[PDB]
Amino acid sequence: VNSFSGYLKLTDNVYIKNADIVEEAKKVKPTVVVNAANVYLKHGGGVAGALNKATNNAMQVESDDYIATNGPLKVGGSCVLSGHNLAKHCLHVVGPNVNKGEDIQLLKSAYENFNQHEVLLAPLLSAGIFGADPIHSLRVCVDTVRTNVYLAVFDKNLYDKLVSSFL
Numbered sequence: 001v002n003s004f005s006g007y008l009k010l011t012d013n014v015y016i017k018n019a020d021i022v023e024e025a026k027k028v029k030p031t032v033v034v035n036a037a038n039v040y041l042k043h044g045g046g047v048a049g050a051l052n053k054a055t056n057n058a059m060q061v062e063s064d065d066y067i068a069t070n071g072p073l074k075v076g077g078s079c080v081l082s083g084h085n086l087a088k089h090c091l092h093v094v095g096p097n098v099n100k101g102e103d104i105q106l107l108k109s110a111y112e113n114f115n116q117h118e119v120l121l122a123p124l125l126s127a128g129i130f131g132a133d134p135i136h137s138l139r140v141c142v143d144t145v146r147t148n149v150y151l152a153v154f155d156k157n158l159y160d161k162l163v164s165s166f167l
């Protein structure tokens with residue numbers, strides 16, 4: 001039993017909700033919140049920009065030190081950093097950005113990072129400003145993640161479509 005509330009159960013381990021991931025994290029304080037990161041961990045907009053804003057830019061400061069030490073992530077890769085005031089940890093995961101011409105096949109590799117954590121709060125990878133079809137992203141999530149994932153979809157209209165179209 002966990003403290004996630006109001007989710008629709010899609011499969012044995014994948015749940016979904018129309019919610020602002022920032023407000024969800026602040027309420028639940030999960031062990032792991034997933035960020036929709038880029039390889040440079042520059043958290044300018046979308047999910048990443050909103051989460052970073054909620055940390056008062058502490059996420060960005062920590063991220064800049066991580067990049068200065070380690071260099072950029074790989075598309076499809078991840079790193080674990082602090083969750084600051086939002087969660088114990090933040091798993092920064094890089095899904096492909098279609099608006100950069102990045103291979104959509106790397107979306108499965110991106111979701112594989114979730115399997116290293118027993119329970120996560122997360123957005124749909126490569127959705128929103130990353131330019132991929134959120135319906136496709138949900139399919140890859142369900143077919144790749146085996147651990148318990150609580151998915152937050154900010155747009156109410158998109159949420160209804162993901163549910164109604166969910167096979």
Ligand SMILES: OC[C@H]1CCCCN1c1ncnc2[nH]ccc12
Nearest residue numbers: 020021050127128152153154155
């Ligand atoms: O709303 C649409 C979804 C899917 C794609 C990208 C942004 N989305 C988000 N989901 C959950 N929390 C969020 N906070 C800020 C953005 C956001």
